[PDB]
Design a protein around this nucleic acid. Structure first.
Ligand code: OGA
Ligand code: OGA
Ligand code: MN
Ligand code: MN
Lengths: 402, 395
DNA sequence: TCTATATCG
DNA sequence: TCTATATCG
């Protein structure tokens, strides 16, 4: 908060001053943050942290590899594809130029990471892996527009734009690189040991152009925050999101895996395969379709990439609904199928209420028309095309009798 | 939340129906909950979980072995002693209740060790794992409390205590709970990190008791769905009291006092200032912050706290010694405990002047002791508010 | 692998 | 061994 003694620190957390980037890059990436901001591609996420619905003070945009997603606090952010070698389409060509810029920024920081990681080993296959960023989450805020910021509760570090947390959904021991852009009373990033409360935390100053890296298991052993300054500030947090079971290819393949048991008639009713089938059904429904509809569609203002695959995933989902109706008709002795799918159906019910709630929640009505969440897939009992109804319990209670 | 097949349930958790404990015991413990309520010995705690100040919907009191304490969410509750062999209870009736909850503790302890044995299909651990040293008594009236958070995962309705873990427990320790429902109360259970598995809500009927054994408390999270009538409850548990009993803090103080110092060896001064911080923020401030309310019931802690205060004052005198003295490795060896002192000092001063801490009735208002303005002569050193650390900070 | 728990009027 | 966030700080 004052003119502090915080430079002496110790690395697993390395800091690299503005003087390390070509300045050729600075203008390009700062212009990318400015164009992205003016077109209105940065939005606040309507997270649901522990049962509570919360808007994030900072406004962000997930950019990265096409087909990749990052789930963070029950919300799954979808990547605006960046032009990775091999061609994708964006709305306006400004946004596409910026996604190009961040893509080269990603490669640059990545190089710096592998190097700093070699320097650290002095105390090889794994590293390259651990420094292979696949996404970057961009943030922005304007401290003079937030009516009230929370206040760091342990070292009187003042207001904070992002409270003590951990970066989530990352490959084990993976590093994270952050480029800070304070516009032209100073911003700082806080770091602290995760469980101790009596060890003074570190606030390291972030000036226009400074970059800081978190290496190895620092993000897991420590928690960090972002203390606010007096001017507005941008930032690109490049990460290597653990995207197994998190890419479009993965969910498509599963779908084909669940649909392999249907020639609506199913090729077999072995309780284990049906279990998987209804679980994959739930996964594509609540982990992809509802989320996208809930918050992804705002990205539609920046890219069309997700329009057709989501629709495919919706068709696939409808077919599962038809297999669900089929198995339900088969139970109209051996009730191992009954004690193999009731949990996935009741879970699908609760998750359906939870999402339905988040959608029509008090906070969710506080944002722009184009951003308000849609509760798709949704359908009233009078729809004929749908095999089953948006459940609301009559069916599970019937299955429960046994 | 209606008649269901939920009773059909599993193994590392046991419910024992009202019909298994003696009616002489139920009347005794039920009368104890009523007397404790009438005397106004149940207060809500002004916890500060993770930096935020919150009042607890349920009202509780910690009763147990003399000299024991239980830390829960940054608040340390002090035990009003229950008779075990010298007790100074303020009112006869409160002392009678603590005697009954002492026999309840023994009883539940026996059933617990039993059920722990039966679950096997050495044996000293089991006994240690079921040696309850404290009990946290709870009461609430759902009518009085209009809006109670709603269970966010299985539509189990309102909750008097959200999904959590019982903390400050010996590893692998069991917990026994006696429920007193005077529209039914339920206890929720679910796998901890698991959000797609439907949770279990077990009905709780006047006189029912449920036990949590082995890791269950660590692998799962439980809650308390509220009913329509008011309810009491005794959660007998074995706090992992080492480092949380008076004898421990007293010895540390003495340990601290063995130094007009006897030595400025960088290691011993470090540990000395650490003991200073521990006694300052983990006993004195907690007792006067949240401790003072229990004097309505018991005066046991008046005697030891005051000794802890006087002694600490002496530790302040040791600090004054070290600041006058300060090659300077006795500087890069004490900065963490003093800066920690500074922050913890703000933290407590804050909890003190918070809105919720200001709205309480006179009996429960938090006291920010030890506190003194610069003007006070007696204290060798001040209440920080920087300067010393800043001066100390250089190089 | 829950847990970044802020509509400041 | 944070994390039971139901009183605007
Ligand atoms: O921008 C920063 O300095 C820090 N941002 C984050 O920690 C994040 O987005 O996870
Ligand atoms: O009273 C009950 O059934 C549950 N109470 C608790 O979980 C508790 O106080 O830790
Ligand atoms: Mn982060
Ligand atoms: Mn509990």
């Amino acid at each position: 908060e004052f003119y502090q003694q915080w430079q002496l620190k110790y690395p697993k957390l390395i800091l690299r001053e503005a003087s390390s980037v070509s300045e050729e890059l600075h203008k390009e990436v700062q212009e990318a943050f400015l164009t992205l901001h003016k077109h209105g591609c940065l939005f606040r996420d309507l997270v649901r942290i522990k049962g509570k619905d919360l808007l994030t003070p900072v406004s962000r945009i997930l950019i990265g590899n096409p087909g990749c997603t990052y789930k963070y606090l029950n919300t799954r952010l979808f990547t605006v594809p960046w032009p990775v070698k091999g061609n994708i389409k964006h709305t306006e060509a400004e946004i596409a130029a910026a996604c190009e810029t961040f893509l080269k920024l990603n490669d640059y920081l990545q190089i710096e990471t592998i190097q700093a990681l070699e320097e650290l080993a002095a105390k090889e296959v794994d590293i390259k892996s651990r420094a292979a960023y696949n996404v970057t989450l961009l943030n922005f805020m304007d401290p003079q527009k937030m009516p009230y910021l929370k206040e760091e509760p342990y070292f009187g570090m003042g207001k904070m734009a992002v409270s003590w947390h951990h970066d989530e959904n990352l490959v084990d021991r993976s590093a994270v690189a952050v480029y800070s852009y304070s516009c032209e009373d100073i911003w700082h990033v806080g770091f602290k040991i995760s469980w101790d409360i009596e060890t003074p935390g570190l606030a390291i100053p972030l000036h226009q152009g400074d970059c800081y890296f978190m290496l190895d298991d620092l993000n897991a052993t420590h928690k960090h925050c972002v203390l606010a300054g007096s001017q507005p500030r941008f930032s690109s947090t490049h990460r290597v999101a653990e995207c197994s079971t998190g890419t479009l290819d993965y969910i498509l393949q599963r779908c084909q895996l669940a649909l392999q048991n249907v020639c609506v008639s199913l090729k077999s009713f072995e309780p284990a395969v049906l279990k998987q089938g209804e679980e994959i059904h739930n996964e594509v429904e609540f982990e992809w379709l509802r989320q996208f509809w809930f918050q992804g569609n705002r990205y539609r203002k920046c890219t069309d990439w997700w329009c057709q695959p989501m629709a495919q995933l919706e068709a696939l989902w409808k077919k599962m609904e038809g297999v669900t109706n089929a198995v339900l008709h088969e139970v109209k002795q051996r009730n191992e199928i009954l004690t193999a799918i009731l949990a996935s159906l009741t879970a699908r019910q609760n998750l359906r209420r939870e999402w339905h709630a988040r959608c029509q929640s008090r906070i969710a009505r506080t944002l722009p028309a184009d951003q308000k969440p849609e509760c798709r897939p949704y359908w009233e009992k009078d729809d004929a095309s749908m095999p089953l109804p948006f459940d609301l319990t009559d069916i599970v209670s019937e299955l429960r009798g046994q």
